[PDB]
């Protein structure tokens, strides 16, 4: 009746877009870097180990100074670790006990947390008497919080379980812009180094490029086959790669609006939990559920090394702001620093 | 200098480690329970026995701390957030009496989940009194949903309430065998099932959970010594 011409028009739009992608696709990136000396093997060993968590760790985040890192666990605690001296700086007792993500503000004054409580709690560090308390309880989401990233001292984008991302406003509690369009639970999102664009990967096997100012999906990136668990931007800002539960990592390009290379292996069945990029972008680190991570060459799809320091499945990892080292957290309540 | 700041971090670390020990002492003495139910399963009646998406009831019985967690406030997609309950003591499942096939296809996915292979499930068949009048009146028998109920036989170990139609006892044990055959289909000794029965006026629900949770902790200790 009425849904016929709308679905048929939506179908034709997908074919002409697919034809436009193949029309602008002539040489694969794998063939371009074929005449380049590969890196080969890299010798990365564990440097620091953290032993101050009880329950499994979900997410973590580094800092702009590459000094501290915050992590969350089911015990209801937020520990701001010291990456050099292995000294705990803060221990925030959470009211809830099902936190699923955490974030570190670029200024180093605020931290984030969220989970099954459907409330994103911002904790201020530079308080008056040194007692860390909650600043604003961002309520309004109709689902569990999956990931969040700070933008400024009063702006933060959250990705809840109601297939909608919201640009909150601290000190006011009212949502400024809500990003809708996903049909699945958004799991993780990454921010470009311009605070203007961000991509969100949901459980519908598609990553949508959003705009912070206007507030709608600018571009839609497809190609995956299962739920997307993580996503990360390329350092230059014109590309990004993501992982899913199909044990494949695909690198997409914003300007080309299509994938460039796939990073996967035959004997890898476990899904990717977290992804990260190096400073130069040559190395691609992706976590897995088989209790160890991997390092991939982002230009030739060669596995440069396997990092197997953890005992349980890894759930979060990230390269420092200067790329000197990379941390990794797993479900064994243990955090490690790899370099 | 750097010695003063480093000493401040050492003092702050020991203060946190002291708080981590004090909180770990009160955390290992509590048992986390996931109260999960279907749509209109009547799990709020169990809460009476002692927006936001999680409800916590810290009811204590026999000087033992129990921490229940309600699901009300979340969505129907239980794929990504069910992984958060791989460390709880047990998952309390409530079934209200096709609302039965949906309960058996969810209990099946939880039992076969790769991260929930060591979490035990406690069952509580709610709406027993209404289930008795539904099969007695015959307006909607379980025969249309399950045609195998006619071929089922009542087990000899049935302990029904005196003065009840054995058809209700046959229906209760048929639902129990349906959930048990799913649990023992992939049961490798890491986690077992504890089916029970509950009505709208039963007051011994906290004692059933206490006896079920006692069996779980008592059985997992036997696996540490490889006695089982």
């Amino acid at each position: 009746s009425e849904l016929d011409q709308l679905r048929q028009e939506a179908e034709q739009l997908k074919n002409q877009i697919r034809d436009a992608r193949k029309a602008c696709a002539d040489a694969t990136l794998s063939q371009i870097t074929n005449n380049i000396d590969p890196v080969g093997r890299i010798q990365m060993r564990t440097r620091r180990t953290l032993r101050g968590h009880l329950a499994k760790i979900y997410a973590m985040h580094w800092g702009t100074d590459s000094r501290l890192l915050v992590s969350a666990s089911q015990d209801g605690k937020l520990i701001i670790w010291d990456s050099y001296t292995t000294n705990k700086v803060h221990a925030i007792p959470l009211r809830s006990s099902w936190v699923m993500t955490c974030a570190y503000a670029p200024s180093g004054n605020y931290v984030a947390c969220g989970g099954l409580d459907n409330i994103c709690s911002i904790y201020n560090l530079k308080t008056r008497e040194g007692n860390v308390r909650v600043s604003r309880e961002l309520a309004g989401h109709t689902g569990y919080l999956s990931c969040c990233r700070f933008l400024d001292d009063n702006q933060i984008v959250t990705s809840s379980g109601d297939t909608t991302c919201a640009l909150w406003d601290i000190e006011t509690g009212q949502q400024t812009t809500t990003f809708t369009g996903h049909t699945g639970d958004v799991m993780s999102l990454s921010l470009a180094p311009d605070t203007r664009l961000f991509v969100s990967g949901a459980c519908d096997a598609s990553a949508k490029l959003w705009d912070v100012r206007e507030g709608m999906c600018r571009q839609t990136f497809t190609g995956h086959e299962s739920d997307i668990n993580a996503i990360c931007f390329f350092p230059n800002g014109n590309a990004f790669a993501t992982g899913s539960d199909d044990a494949t990592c695909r690198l997409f390009d914003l300007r080309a609006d299509q994938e460039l290379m796939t990073y996967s292996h035959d004997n890898i069945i476990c899904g990717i939990t977290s992804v990260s990029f190096s400073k130069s972008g040559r190395l691609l680190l992706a976590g897995y559920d088989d209790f160890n991570c991997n390092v991939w060459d982002a230009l030739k799809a060669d596995r440069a090394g396997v990092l197997a320091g953890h005992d349980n499945r890894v759930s979060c990892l990230g390269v420092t702001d200067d790329g000197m080292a990379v941390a990794t957290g797993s479900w064994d309540s243990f955090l490690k620093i790899w370099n | 200098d750097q010695r003063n700041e480093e000493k401040a971090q050492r003092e702050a670390n020991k203060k946190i480690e002291k708080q981590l020990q004090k909180d770990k002492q009160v955390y290992r003495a509590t048992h986390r329970l996931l109260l999960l139910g279907a749509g209109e399963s009547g799990k709020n009646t169990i809460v009476k026995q002692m927006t936001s998406g999680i409800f916590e009831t810290k009811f204590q019985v026999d000087k033992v701390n129990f921490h229940m967690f309600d699901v009300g406030g979340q969505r129907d997609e239980r794929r990504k957030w069910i992984q958060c309950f791989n460390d709880v003591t047990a998952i309390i499942f409530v079934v209200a009496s096709n609302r039965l096939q949906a309960a058996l296809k969810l209990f099946d996915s939880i039992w076969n989940n790769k991260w929930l292979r060591d979490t035990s499930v406690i069952l509580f068949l709610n709406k027993q009194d209404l289930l008795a009048e539904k099969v007695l009146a015959g307006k909607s028998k379980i025969e249309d949903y399950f045609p195998e109920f006619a071929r089922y036989t009542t087990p000899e170990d049935a302990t029904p309430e005196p003065g009840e139609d054995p058809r209700v006892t046959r229906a209760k044990y048929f639902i129990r065998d349906e959930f048990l055959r799913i649990s023992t289909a992939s049961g490798d000794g890491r986690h077992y099932c504890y089916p029970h029965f509950t009505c709208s006026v039963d007051t011994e629900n906290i004692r059933r959970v206490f006896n079920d949770c006692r069996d779980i902790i008592q059985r997992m200790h036997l696996r540490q010594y490889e006695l089982l």
Partner: nanobody
Amino acid sequence: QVQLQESGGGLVQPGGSLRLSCAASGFTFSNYKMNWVRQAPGKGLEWVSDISQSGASISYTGSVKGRFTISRDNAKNTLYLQMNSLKPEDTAVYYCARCPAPFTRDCFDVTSTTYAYRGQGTQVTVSS
């Protein structure tokens, strides 16, 4: 881009036969467990059947157990659903659902009303 298109279905006489074909694309058919789900008019979604990776583990719901027949072809990426002796109570739209993670015994969110890994389905009506 995961795409699931269902074929067949329509007005069928009571006691007849019907067949539904589920064409799959955008993923490897030999790695994901497939399911079936129906939505009765004015009622919530109801699970129908499911098939394992190689078609070994087959399970049906009690309403249509033994009555229906399912089969999959990994080389063609096409799913089949056979119906025999249709009843006036089975009139509903049938969706071709696939639970997300590959090589997993669990199979979640098939019955949920907001699921991305399932097609628009085909309406099946049984009347005179």
